Design a protein around this ligand. Structure first.
Ligand SMILES: *[C@@H]1O[C@H](CO)[C@@H](O[C@@H]2O[C@H](CO)[C@@H](O)[C@H](O)[C@H]2NC(C)=O)[C@H](O)[C@H]1NC(C)=O
Ligand SMILES: *[C@@H]1O[C@H](CO)[C@@H](O[C@@H]2O[C@H](CO)[C@@H](O)[C@H](O)[C@H]2NC(C)=O)[C@H](O)[C@H]1NC(C)=O
Ligand SMILES: *[C@@H]1O[C@H](CO)[C@@H](O[C@@H]2O[C@H](CO)[C@@H](O)[C@H](O)[C@H]2NC(C)=O)[C@H](O)[C@H]1NC(C)=O
Ligand SMILES: *[C@@H]1O[C@H](CO)[C@@H](O[C@@H]2O[C@H](CO)[C@@H](O)[C@H](O)[C@H]2NC(C)=O)[C@H](O)[C@H]1NC(C)=O
Ligand SMILES: *[C@@H]1O[C@H](CO)[C@@H](O[C@@H]2O[C@H](CO)[C@@H](O)[C@H](O)[C@H]2NC(C)=O)[C@H](O)[C@H]1NC(C)=O
Ligand SMILES: *[C@@H]1O[C@H](CO)[C@@H](O[C@@H]2O[C@H](CO)[C@@H](O)[C@H](O)[C@H]2NC(C)=O)[C@H](O)[C@H]1NC(C)=O
Ligand SMILES: *[C@@H]1O[C@H](CO)[C@@H](O[C@@H]2O[C@H](CO)[C@@H](O)[C@H](O)[C@H]2NC(C)=O)[C@H](O)[C@H]1NC(C)=O
Ligand SMILES: *[C@@H]1O[C@H](CO)[C@@H](O[C@@H]2O[C@H](CO)[C@@H](O)[C@H](O)[C@H]2NC(C)=O)[C@H](O)[C@H]1NC(C)=O
Ligand SMILES: *[C@@H]1O[C@H](CO)[C@@H](O[C@@H]2O[C@H](CO)[C@@H](O)[C@H](O)[C@H]2NC(C)=O)[C@H](O)[C@H]1NC(C)=O
Ligand code: NAG
Ligand code: NAG
Ligand code: NAG
Lengths: 50, 418, 85, 198, 37
């Protein structure tokens, strides 16, 4: 699963059959790290209109 | 040919001459305004796909387009009922005329409801209603034509029996030759003119109402504004029907032929082409329906403004409630529309007079309190501006300001003292 | 009804104000769910005669509200970012 | 539900934004709605086709959103032109237009700011406690017809007065509040009463 | 996902200041401030 974002520690608790989480637009907003089983929020990198 | 704009009318202007009307015409004119459209609802799923479940399974890949089209059409459908509610339901009291139609010679039988007709319409409204002729559903309007006719009957009874008082509060009764005199004073003509010539004004009003009925019965293109809306809506629905017969590049326009002639790997492609063509057609139809709904809403807001300002009161706005000085207006229901009969005052039989801004008397300048100084050649009088009624220039109809040395064009004349 | 068949609403002969519009003069309300012909307004016969007038002897200073929208939320969409990211 | 007109506009704009965001979850016939999945699964000759399907679906969604946004902008512009007209004619002046500045005879108005809107407090005059009177178009006196200058002739049963039209204030019928035009033979319904001279 | 909300040019306190100015004008001066001084 490729992407670009900022990885932060998450308060969401995934069920053991769940690997990722999707938002309204079906983009991965939360992911489980496959080595250390912790949940990470994926915030999109900051975008500002110029 | 090169078109002409009208007849040349060189107005005989000079610095000391005025034209004063000596007579009047009670003129009734028609104004037709559309209010609502036909409330159409389209099942998007049945229009694109019918009963084919594979087509709907492929249509679910496009998301909530059908929900947006249904919601836009639902908004248009409730907007039409809101338009009719804003135009016709401006009173919460259902007024009736008295059984005795003694209105001082004024005849309202062509605009009051006919008891002999089962539809309870006026003869004018009956003539107006006679002169108007795949997932698709037509929702009925919330107000039926009988209740719109009942609303117009209540408005007519209120404006006949109570004046403009019912539009501003409780309906306060007033005799109709007094109501008319009040309207005459609203346009700046004295009450006496109405009272002295009440039989002639009643005869002119009845003749104008009959000419309105004759002109509506004799002109096929009188109700073209409502007929244009009806024809546009029907033609848009017919185009939306005829878009189903186009294959849009597929092998056939029928989903059953594709599903029976081809395996699902290529039938998916052909059905996808038909789906995107029919979805583009439905989006085009909904977009032009929204634009026409905005136009009809603007026309209905205008019609509600005319209902408030011409029927429920006397308007000073020029050409808003007919050509001429507006006296009153009468509402009539029409199929998806309203017809305003504007009763207006038109000056006629004007006459030249020699005029002056002020009268010099005893070293003082006298100016008219409400009228204007006129002269027929030898004698000076003061008259009201919209009707020739010469009166002796006294201290009771003039006021004094300054001497005679300042006003340009002041003339010497005596000023009587009672 | 002229709009169609209505199942689950008790039709009554009384006329009320329209709460939920059904169409063709039919409206629905909750009191169970009832369906009725709507009332246009209260009846009122103006006592017209050719020599009588009604003159107000008092007045009410009435303040009414009128709410009119002025603007919307100014939304901007980056078309390239929305389509493609 | 007093402020439903502003809340309707807010709900419509938020629902249009939510629909536009929701339309990204649709694949529009492609293998996936995620662009990164297509770009990581497929070679560019077929990923071009899948991305083309996603592009035309999202472009159709965005054009639809802009179309109803322009239609709603036209509606809001018409409502704002109406609000500016009400601010000019009801707040900055007294309007003779019936029901333009509230129900009744309009006295004055107050503007109040609201979220994306304006609230007009229309102060109006409503007539109340009306009373029947016997009325006449003119008064016949000394062979002359007398008409009210600004009011109306009323009678409480035995005595004749002249009053202003929107409020009962009876006054003695004099030469100062009446004017003379013609004799008594022309006006239909003229009655006999004395006219006082101060 | 590319959506932005632009703030309005007039904030709510400046719109309230405009309405307060209109209220002060129509209370202290009637309709005269709308037609001139
Ligand atoms: C008032 O007087 C003027 C001038 O005497 C009249 O204007 C003339 O009208 C005749 C008839 O149409 C024309 O042939 C002349 O050319 C006009 N003269 C000018 C200078 O315009 C006018 O008709 C008179 N008004 C009325 C109501 O009779
Ligand atoms: C004012 O105009 C009316 C018409 O609107 C005139 O009334 C007509 O008078 C003629 C001659 O007296 C009659 O033949 C017609 O039948 C009348 N018509 C109507 C509808 O009654 C009236 O005479 C005019 N008055 C003046 C002073 O010019
Ligand atoms: C009011 O107007 C109506 C219609 O203009 C008059 O009814 C006409 O009466 C005459 C004579 O009685 C008949 O010859 C016509 O056929 C009637 N017309 C219609 C359409 O019915 C009516 O007389 C007028 N006056 C009153 C007091 O109602
Ligand atoms: C202008 O009007 C006045 C009054 O209407 C006219 O004066 C009258 O004229 C008639 C006809 O000669 C006389 O019998 C009256 O005695 C006059 N009244 C007075 C008070 O003098 C005057 O003639 C008119 N002028 C024109 C040019 O028509
Ligand atoms: C209107 O009346 C005034 C005063 O009655 C006239 O003014 C006089 O004019 C004569 C000759 O021009 C002078 O000798 C007097 O001294 C003037 N008197 C005053 C008080 O100014 C004026 O001429 C008259 N106008 C007309 C058109 O006859
Ligand atoms: C003015 O007089 C009329 C007629 O006398 C009154 O109208 C009547 O009012 C009674 C009481 O509500 C009703 O029962 C009658 O049916 C009415 N008659 C008609 C013809 O409508 C009217 O109420 C009086 N106005 C006031 C303010 O008292
Ligand atoms: C006009 O109406 C007002 C109310 O709008 C009346 O004032 C009321 O009078 C009664 C008795 O005098 C009091 O109990 C109330 O408290 C008053 N109300 C208010 C708001 O002050 C007034 O009396 C009426 N005048 C006439 C002549 O009928
Ligand atoms: C109509 O109003 C007039 C004036 O308000 C009443 O006349 C007065 O009535 C009172 C009470 O009887 C007397 O004390 C006065 O002397 C009367 N004034 C005059 C000038 O006569 C009259 O009574 C009222 N009529 C009715 C039927 O109420
Ligand atoms: C109003 O007054 C006039 C004049 O005083 C009355 O007219 C008189 O009526 C009688 C009989 O009806 C006649 O003999 C006279 O010749 C009339 N006089 C004039 C000048 O025409 C009239 O009747 C009175 N009306 C009422 C209702 O009292
Ligand atoms: C290796 O991965 C497993 C689960 O995938 C995890 O439990 C373990 O801690 C990992 N070990 C290291 C050294 O990362
Ligand atoms: C009107 O014009 C004439 C010349 O055409 C002139 O003699 C007269 O003084 C003028 N009157 C006024 C009031 O300007
Ligand atoms: C009013 O009607 C009555 C009959 O109801 C009649 O006697 C009277 O003359 C009429 N008055 C007017 C001014 O029409």
């Amino acid at each position: 699963l490729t992407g670009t974002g900022v990885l932060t520690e998450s308060n969401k608790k995934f069920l053991p059959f769940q690997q990722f989480g999707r938002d309204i637009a079906d983009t991965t907003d939360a992911v489980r790290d496959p080595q250390t089983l912790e949940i990470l929020d994926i915030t999109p990198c900051s975008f500002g209109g110029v | 040919y090169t078109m002409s704009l009208g007849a040349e009318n060189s107005v005989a202007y000079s610095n000391n001459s005025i034209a004063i009307p000596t007579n009047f015409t009670i003129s009734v004119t028609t104004e037709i305004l559309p209010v609502s459209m036909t409330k159409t609802s389209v099942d998007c799923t049945m229009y694109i796909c019918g009963d084919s479940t594979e087509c709907s399974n492929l249509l679910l890949q496009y998301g909530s387009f059908c929900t947006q089209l249904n919601r836009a059409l639902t908004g248009i459908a409730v907007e039409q009922d809101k338009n009719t509610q804003e135009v016709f339901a401006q009173v919460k009291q259902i007024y009736k005329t008295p059984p005795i139609k003694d209105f001082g010679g004024f005849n309202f039988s062509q605009i009051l409801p006919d008891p002999s007709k089962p539809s309870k319409r006026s003869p004018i409204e009956d003539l107006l209603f006679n002169k108007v002729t795949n997932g698709l559903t037509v929702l009925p309007p919330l107000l039926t034509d009988e209740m719109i006719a009942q609303y117009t009957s209540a408005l007519l009874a209120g404006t006949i029996t109570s004046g403009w008082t019912f539009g501003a509060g409780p309906a306060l009764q007033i005799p109709f030759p007094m109501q008319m005199a009040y309207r005459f004073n609203g346009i700046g003509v004295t009450q006496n003119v109405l009272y002295e010539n009440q039989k002639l004004i009643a005869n002119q009003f009845n003749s104008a109402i009959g000419k309105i009925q004759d002109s509506l019965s004799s002109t096929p293109s009188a109700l073209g504004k409502l007929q244009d809306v009806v024809n546009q809506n029907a033609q848009a629905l017919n185009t939306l029907v005829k878009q189903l017969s186009s294959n849009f590049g597929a092998i056939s326009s029928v989903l059953n032929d594709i599903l029976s002639r081809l395996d699902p790997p290529e039938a998916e492609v052909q059905i996808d082409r038909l789906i995107t063509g029919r979805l583009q057609s439905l989006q085009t139809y909904v977009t032009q329906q929204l634009i026409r709904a905005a136009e009809i809403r603007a026309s209905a807001n205008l019609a509600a403004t005319k209902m408030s300002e011409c029927v429920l009161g006397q308007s000073k706005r020029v050409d808003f409630c007919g050509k001429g000085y507006h006296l009153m207006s009468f509402p009539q229901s029409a199929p998806h529309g309203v017809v305003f009969l504007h009763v207006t005052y038109v000056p006629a039989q004007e006459k030249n007079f020699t005029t002056a801004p002020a009268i010099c008397h005893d070293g003082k300048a006298h100016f008219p309190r409400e009228g204007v100084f006129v002269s027929n050649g030898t004698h000076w009088f003061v008259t009201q501006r919209n009707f020739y009624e010469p009166q002796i220039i006294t201290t009771d109809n003039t006021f004094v300001s300054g001497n005679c040395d300042v006003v340009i064009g002041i003339v010497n004349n005596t000023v009587y003292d009672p | 009804t002229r709009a169609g068949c209505l199942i689950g609403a008790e039709h009554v002969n009384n006329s009320y104000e329209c709460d939920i519009p059904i169409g063709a003069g039919i409206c629905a309300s909750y009191q169970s769910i009832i369906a009725y012909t709507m009332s246009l307004g209260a009846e009122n016969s103006v006592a017209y005669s050719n020599n009588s007038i009604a003159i107000p002897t008092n007045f009410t200073i009435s303040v009414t509200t009128e709410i009119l929208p002025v603007s919307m939320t100014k939304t901007s969409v980056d078309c390239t970012m929305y389509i493609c990211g």
